[PDB]
Design a protein around this motif. Sequence first.
Motif, PDB file in Angstrom:
ATOM      1  N   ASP B  84       0.800  -1.217   0.000  1.00  0.00           N
ATOM      2  CA  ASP B  84       0.000   0.000   0.000  1.00  0.00           C
ATOM      3  C   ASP B  84       0.836   1.271   0.000  1.00  0.00           C
ATOM      4  O   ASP B  84       0.276   2.363   0.130  1.00  0.00           O
ATOM      5  CB  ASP B  84      -0.955   0.008   1.198  1.00  0.00           C
ATOM      6  CG  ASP B  84      -0.233  -0.049   2.524  1.00  0.00           C
ATOM      7  OD1 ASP B  84       1.004  -0.206   2.536  1.00  0.00           O
ATOM      8  OD2 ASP B  84      -0.911   0.073   3.564  1.00  0.00           O
TER       9      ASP B  84
ATOM     10  N   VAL F  55      -8.728   1.057  -4.130  1.00  0.00           N
ATOM     11  CA  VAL F  55      -9.004  -0.286  -3.639  1.00  0.00           C
ATOM     12  C   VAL F  55      -8.717  -1.277  -4.757  1.00  0.00           C
ATOM     13  O   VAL F  55      -9.296  -1.187  -5.845  1.00  0.00           O
ATOM     14  CB  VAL F  55     -10.451  -0.405  -3.154  1.00  0.00           C
ATOM     15  CG1 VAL F  55     -10.719  -1.814  -2.669  1.00  0.00           C
ATOM     16  CG2 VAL F  55     -10.727   0.605  -2.061  1.00  0.00           C
ATOM     17  N   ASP F  56      -7.824  -2.225  -4.496  1.00  0.00           N
ATOM     18  CA  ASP F  56      -7.415  -3.165  -5.528  1.00  0.00           C
ATOM     19  C   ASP F  56      -8.584  -4.047  -5.943  1.00  0.00           C
ATOM     20  O   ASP F  56      -9.347  -4.531  -5.104  1.00  0.00           O
ATOM     21  CB  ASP F  56      -6.258  -4.026  -5.034  1.00  0.00           C
ATOM     22  CG  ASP F  56      -5.653  -4.866  -6.135  1.00  0.00           C
ATOM     23  OD1 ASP F  56      -5.975  -4.615  -7.314  1.00  0.00           O
ATOM     24  OD2 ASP F  56      -4.859  -5.778  -5.825  1.00  0.00           O
ATOM     25  N   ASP F  57      -8.732  -4.247  -7.253  1.00  0.00           N
ATOM     26  CA  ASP F  57      -9.832  -5.054  -7.763  1.00  0.00           C
ATOM     27  C   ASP F  57      -9.416  -5.953  -8.920  1.00  0.00           C
ATOM     28  O   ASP F  57     -10.284  -6.597  -9.523  1.00  0.00           O
ATOM     29  CB  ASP F  57     -10.997  -4.164  -8.202  1.00  0.00           C
ATOM     30  CG  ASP F  57     -10.628  -3.247  -9.346  1.00  0.00           C
ATOM     31  OD1 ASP F  57      -9.419  -3.035  -9.570  1.00  0.00           O
ATOM     32  OD2 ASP F  57     -11.545  -2.735 -10.020  1.00  0.00           O
ATOM     33  N   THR F  63      -3.025  -8.989  -4.037  1.00  0.00           N
ATOM     34  CA  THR F  63      -3.370  -7.856  -3.193  1.00  0.00           C
ATOM     35  C   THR F  63      -4.843  -7.485  -3.277  1.00  0.00           C
ATOM     36  O   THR F  63      -5.194  -6.332  -3.009  1.00  0.00           O
ATOM     37  CB  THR F  63      -2.520  -6.646  -3.576  1.00  0.00           C
ATOM     38  OG1 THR F  63      -2.796  -6.295  -4.935  1.00  0.00           O
ATOM     39  CG2 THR F  63      -1.047  -6.969  -3.451  1.00  0.00           C
ATOM     40  N   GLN F  64      -5.707  -8.422  -3.651  1.00  0.00           N
ATOM     41  CA  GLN F  64      -7.105  -8.095  -3.891  1.00  0.00           C
ATOM     42  C   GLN F  64      -7.798  -7.652  -2.610  1.00  0.00           C
ATOM     43  O   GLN F  64      -7.542  -8.183  -1.527  1.00  0.00           O
ATOM     44  CB  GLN F  64      -7.833  -9.295  -4.486  1.00  0.00           C
ATOM     45  CG  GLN F  64      -9.302  -9.049  -4.735  1.00  0.00           C
ATOM     46  CD  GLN F  64     -10.019 -10.288  -5.221  1.00  0.00           C
ATOM     47  OE1 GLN F  64      -9.482 -11.393  -5.158  1.00  0.00           O
ATOM     48  NE2 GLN F  64     -11.243 -10.111  -5.708  1.00  0.00           N
ATOM     49  N   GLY F  65      -8.674  -6.659  -2.741  1.00  0.00           N
ATOM     50  CA  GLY F  65      -9.494  -6.210  -1.636  1.00  0.00           C
ATOM     51  C   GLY F  65      -8.816  -5.303  -0.635  1.00  0.00           C
ATOM     52  O   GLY F  65      -9.434  -4.968   0.382  1.00  0.00           O
ATOM     53  N   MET F  66      -7.575  -4.892  -0.878  1.00  0.00           N
ATOM     54  CA  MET F  66      -6.856  -4.026   0.043  1.00  0.00           C
ATOM     55  C   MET F  66      -6.326  -2.812  -0.702  1.00  0.00           C
ATOM     56  O   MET F  66      -6.243  -2.795  -1.931  1.00  0.00           O
ATOM     57  CB  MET F  66      -5.694  -4.754   0.733  1.00  0.00           C
ATOM     58  CG  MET F  66      -4.774  -5.488  -0.217  1.00  0.00           C
ATOM     59  SD  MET F  66      -3.462  -6.387   0.624  1.00  0.00           S
ATOM     60  CE  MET F  66      -2.446  -5.032   1.199  1.00  0.00           C
ATOM     61  N   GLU F  67      -5.960  -1.793   0.069  1.00  0.00           N
ATOM     62  CA  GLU F  67      -5.498  -0.541  -0.504  1.00  0.00           C
ATOM     63  C   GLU F  67      -4.125  -0.719  -1.134  1.00  0.00           C
ATOM     64  O   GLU F  67      -3.312  -1.529  -0.688  1.00  0.00           O
ATOM     65  CB  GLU F  67      -5.426   0.536   0.572  1.00  0.00           C
ATOM     66  CG  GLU F  67      -6.767   0.879   1.171  1.00  0.00           C
ATOM     67  CD  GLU F  67      -7.697   1.514   0.180  1.00  0.00           C
ATOM     68  OE1 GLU F  67      -7.211   2.218  -0.723  1.00  0.00           O
ATOM     69  OE2 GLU F  67      -8.918   1.296   0.298  1.00  0.00           O
ATOM     70  N   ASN F 326     -11.999   2.286  -8.111  1.00  0.00           N
ATOM     71  CA  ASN F 326     -12.494   2.991  -6.932  1.00  0.00           C
ATOM     72  C   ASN F 326     -11.359   3.844  -6.377  1.00  0.00           C
ATOM     73  O   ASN F 326     -10.555   3.390  -5.565  1.00  0.00           O
ATOM     74  CB  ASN F 326     -13.015   2.004  -5.896  1.00  0.00           C
ATOM     75  CG  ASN F 326     -13.541   2.687  -4.656  1.00  0.00           C
ATOM     76  OD1 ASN F 326     -13.904   3.863  -4.688  1.00  0.00           O
ATOM     77  ND2 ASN F 326     -13.579   1.955  -3.550  1.00  0.00           N
ATOM     78  N   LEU F 328      -9.739   6.478  -4.071  1.00  0.00           N
ATOM     79  CA  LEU F 328      -9.976   6.991  -2.730  1.00  0.00           C
ATOM     80  C   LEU F 328      -9.267   8.307  -2.462  1.00  0.00           C
ATOM     81  O   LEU F 328      -9.856   9.212  -1.867  1.00  0.00           O
ATOM     82  CB  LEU F 328      -9.530   5.965  -1.691  1.00  0.00           C
ATOM     83  CG  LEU F 328     -10.366   4.694  -1.633  1.00  0.00           C
ATOM     84  CD1 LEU F 328     -10.045   3.929  -0.373  1.00  0.00           C
ATOM     85  CD2 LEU F 328     -11.839   5.032  -1.699  1.00  0.00           C
TER      86      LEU F 328
END
Lengths: 88, 132, 138, 44, 159, 337
Positions: B84, F55-57, F63-67, F326, F328
């Motif tokens: 991140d 948001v990773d997609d 890393t799916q579902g996390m920033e 998405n 942010l």
Amino acid sequence: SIVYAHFPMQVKVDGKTLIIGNFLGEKKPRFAKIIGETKVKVSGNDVTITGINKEDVGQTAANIEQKTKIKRFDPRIFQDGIYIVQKA
Amino acid sequence: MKGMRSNIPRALNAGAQIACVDNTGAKVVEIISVKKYRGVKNRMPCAGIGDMCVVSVKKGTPEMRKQVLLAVVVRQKQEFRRPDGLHVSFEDNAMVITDEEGIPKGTDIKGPVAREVAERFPKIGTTASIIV
Amino acid sequence: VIDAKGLILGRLASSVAKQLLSGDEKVYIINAEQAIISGSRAATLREYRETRERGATEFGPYFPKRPDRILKRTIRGMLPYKRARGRDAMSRLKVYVGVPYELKGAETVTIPDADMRLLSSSRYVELGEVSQKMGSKF
Amino acid sequence: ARFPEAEERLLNKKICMKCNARNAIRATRCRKCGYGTLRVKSKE
Amino acid sequence: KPGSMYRNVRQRSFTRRKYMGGVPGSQVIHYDMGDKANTSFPVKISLIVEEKCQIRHTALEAARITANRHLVADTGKMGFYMKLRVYPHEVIRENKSGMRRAFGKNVGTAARVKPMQKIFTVAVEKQNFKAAKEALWHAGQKLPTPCRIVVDEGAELVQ
Amino acid sequence: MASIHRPKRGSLAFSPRKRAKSHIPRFRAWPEATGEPKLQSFAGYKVGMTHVIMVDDTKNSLTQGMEISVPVTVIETPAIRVAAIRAYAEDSTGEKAIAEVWAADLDPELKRRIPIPAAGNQAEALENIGKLIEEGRVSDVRAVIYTLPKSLTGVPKKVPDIMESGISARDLGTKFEYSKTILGTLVSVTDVFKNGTLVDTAAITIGKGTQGPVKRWGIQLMKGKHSRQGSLRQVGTLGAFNPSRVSWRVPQMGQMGYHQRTEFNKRILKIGSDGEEVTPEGGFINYGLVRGDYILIKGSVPGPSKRLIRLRDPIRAKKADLGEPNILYISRESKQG
RNA sequence: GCUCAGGAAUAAGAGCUGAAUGCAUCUAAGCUCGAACUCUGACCUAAAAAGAGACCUCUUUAAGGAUUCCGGUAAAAGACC
RNA sequence: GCAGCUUGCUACCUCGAUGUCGGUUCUUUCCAUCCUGGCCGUGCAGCAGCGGCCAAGGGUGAGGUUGUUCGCCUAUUAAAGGAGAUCGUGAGCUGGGUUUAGACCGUCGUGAGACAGGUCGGUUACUAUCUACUAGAGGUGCCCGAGGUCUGCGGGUAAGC
RNA sequence: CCCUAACUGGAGUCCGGUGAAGCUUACAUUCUAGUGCACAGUCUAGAGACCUCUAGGGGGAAGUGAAGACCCCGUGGAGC
RNA sequence: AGCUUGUAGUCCGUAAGGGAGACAACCCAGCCCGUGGUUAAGGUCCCCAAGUGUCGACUAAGUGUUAAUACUAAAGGGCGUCCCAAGCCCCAGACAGCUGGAAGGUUAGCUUAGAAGCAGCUACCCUUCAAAGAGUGCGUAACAGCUCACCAGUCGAGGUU
Ligand SMILES: [Mg+2]
Ligand SMILES: [Mg+2]
Ligand SMILES: [Mg+2]
Ligand SMILES: [Mg+2]
Ligand SMILES: [Zn+2]
């Protein structure tokens, strides 16, 4: 004619191809082309192939036999696919 | 092996001496080679966090000394980035004597270890106490 | 104009080359993509592949790919194209793939010698097939 | 699994003893090199 | 040494025992084979040569051995009479300095031949003719010259 | 001799390495149409880079579902004008332009590039093209567009850039009808690309001038004792004894940079309309601040700031439809210090 | 940060049809499959392609081009924007 | 029988000089295939082997001794193939060995001296005339004058393994 | 060294002044194979090539410097 | 060995001109100058002067398209194709197939239980009928049938060494 030991086969006519599903634990089903107007019919453990062109029916049967050959084992112990019990 | 979320630079170099941080009985080791590394011409083999590599014991108990073993890197002084966006670094390199699977011969680890080796090798994660 | 529909390649080239050198008006070969090259399939394909990939990039032999280019190159060899006579002869030759619009409906003639009917067997290939095997869109 | 048709169309052929090419049954000459002697495909 | 080293006839003969020295012996032990005391074989075929050359004695020995084995295996021990003909009288020398005093020294023995000159001869019955041809064809395989088979006596019987 | 094998230095798939003959990238291949009529390309000007927290997609990714933090390039895309229609004919020797019809109304600043065409035939020329298509001579239709850099401020130039695009349809008649409908109008970037889709980018890269073999092909320096003997950044050997020539595949010095390059499968993350949402404090370095509408591209793009970037829909994409990202947070920190 | 295929024709090889040699046979004609190879498809360059190109626009004492001047996404000099 | 990649044989060219061995850098060619792709046989159950056929697109590395080529050894690795190019490459590099003049040890010689044995030391010249190649420009040729946008005869690629 | 990067001063690149020398039978825009005293830009057969100029490193001209220091020969020398 | 050393003839050395792709010594020719004519070697699809010449066959491999030659691959094999001769069976009927037959006895001698025609002596296992076997193989502890060898009905012209 059809033969198998453990994995039952789903021979299904669809379009101009014959799809073989679940051949020796197979997720990607194999495809066999149909040449000309050679109408084929599936019934249990046997396949009948009609037609008016001799080379056409012969080549269709040859394709069906050649698609279902397992090529990494021993013919003594593995013997599956479609075999011709009687030529055209 | 299983992929890591983070990106790890290959900092330590074949020839480096690391201070092993377990209770197996060795203090210093010498990286000989790196598992799963082909390389190109003139390039020395290199290893980073979570890389299984064969070493040699240089300082330690007489029975352990002069032994070729397997070990992984748990810390490195060269920075690497989180998924991140952030960069993490340590003051010193470290290594633990283990087996091919990943079971560490020592039942106690001193100091923190990177969380990515904890996810790749669960046993190192459990045997550790503090993870950063 | 000369129609290359079903004519031997070397025979046609030799006749056209000689009657260009004799000195006249210019000549036109149309349909230069179904000219015949006698010989087995594999040998013809092998020889033309080796001819194609033979040069060096700066100065090596640049063998063409297009069919009319191949026919022109074949005629180019039976002719002193380095001399003045040969260059003047090469200036009066035009081989077209298909039929150009201006030569549409034009009066044609043929070389009675180079005829595929004058061949013992059915061992031959057509020029367009070799052109497409060499990777040319025509 | 030994079945009639599978053995009929799989291991009922002769083998060239020089180049290992498989031939038909009622043959005495390799179709690709012409070697005189042909054995039979090994059974069990 | 290789076979083709001493096979051509380019120079004079060299065979006088009393002038040269130290010629090594031979391996061929017997020049007559099979039933010597019989003289009633109606078919008499033989192996002939198609070109002039020199045959080492080792080649002759190998050919004799193979023909003997085949003939005994098929025809029988008393059903034939093989007889080699050419004896090795020539001598072979191999230099062994460079070209300084390059004259060689004796290393072996060879038997010169001439075109259409018989080498072997086999006599058999009528029922073992094909076996005789089969035996004589293998023997010519070890021989350093092209060879053909001629049926000398009883040609009308076999043919 | 026991030789140690090494992959060749640099790539020969881009040779000869010479300066691009134009400052505008040219497209050699157009994709296959798989939908309703629309242009297949667009143009814009590169500004700079930032990063966003999204948001990773990506499906099946670790890393799916996390920033995550992603680098993005901001591209300014003022609306373009469709200025002409060109018709091509197919024969043995490939396509051949056979007709063009220009729009009646045009921008006065186009006089800087070419003299303004005068309004002669418009309806008659269009019906001429229609008759040609009706008699089956025309095979495809292409549109001629130009940009209007006068609205921007960070780009000094005031003269338009002219280029040819392609229409996407399943029939020539449909392409002709759509071209008639859109001729001589303004097309916005939203009418060409949908948010979240992939694109292909082309542009002229940054120029470095003449460079030596080490920086042009990445060859090895001289090592050890050889590093102080007279030749350090020169190439080892220019060839063998035979053949008696220097091969064209040997590394040598020459032009580096300012070539045309293409990047594949760059994702579009956001279609914006107001420039205050991307402009950092103090503006971008050497550019200024954004005034019109823009577009965010994931990753990097060839070419420096104030360079023209062309975009076309993907030509070798693999993945299926992705979806709207998405976003942010968009970083507006100062790029300076 | 991005970095694919798909298709055509083939090699060894596996088959169909088929006679010389009534039968049989992958071959003698003919046909179907078949590789990181070959071609096509992506990508970079290319009217000085001597068959030396196509189309459109503006204008022939003009259109337009250069030099001077203020500069840099370019730059060894030239060139380029 | 083939190759000319080991050593021999010859004396056809070069003594008014064609700068030696090994390593380094960079480019390319062959196939007699080490791995990767496809097939056939087996005394091939599976895994893994053994033998052969097509295939030269890509890969073929890091270190200890030794001047070494060659060869031995170590831990990895899909594998860590062999040859050719004036035994590729000194108007590119190095100078470890061999091959000058100095000296020591052993063995020969009465001795000056020698070794085909060992050891220590021991200068690496040149401003590119022609051609080739890598990039950048000015002309002339085709052409109504100028500008723009294209096509594509051809060239290149490993762009991925 | 892995594996190179940025920077500083002197040259080089560009402009003004001054101002040499060394290779040179002739021509010469080349590449492949053959042939030939068996290692050809000039011969034989093909293939390519519009001309001029600038920069650049040295593939080739068996590049230049020099009547070989290695081996042999001379009814040539010198020292020991 | 385009090696070294002899011998007879003729050449290059010291030999033009014509033809061999070029070729010291291979073929024609030994040559004062100028003009006309006919030939030699060799050639006649185009490069290139003169034949897309005539008659009878062969080759399917781009094999070959190369007097001599320092410049051109061998043993071995081919039911590849074109010829000659010699034997053998033959339209009252030969070969390949269509067919069945291969029944008498035996389950041959066999110790392992069993190698019962197919591990291991023997011999035609029937006085007899086309066939009938000590007999190959799918099968086969042993077998067994299915049946090998071996003949018989059947087509309908050449077959075979
Ligand atoms: Mg050099
Ligand atoms: Mg004397
Ligand atoms: Mg004379
Ligand atoms: Mg002469
Ligand atoms: Zn075979």
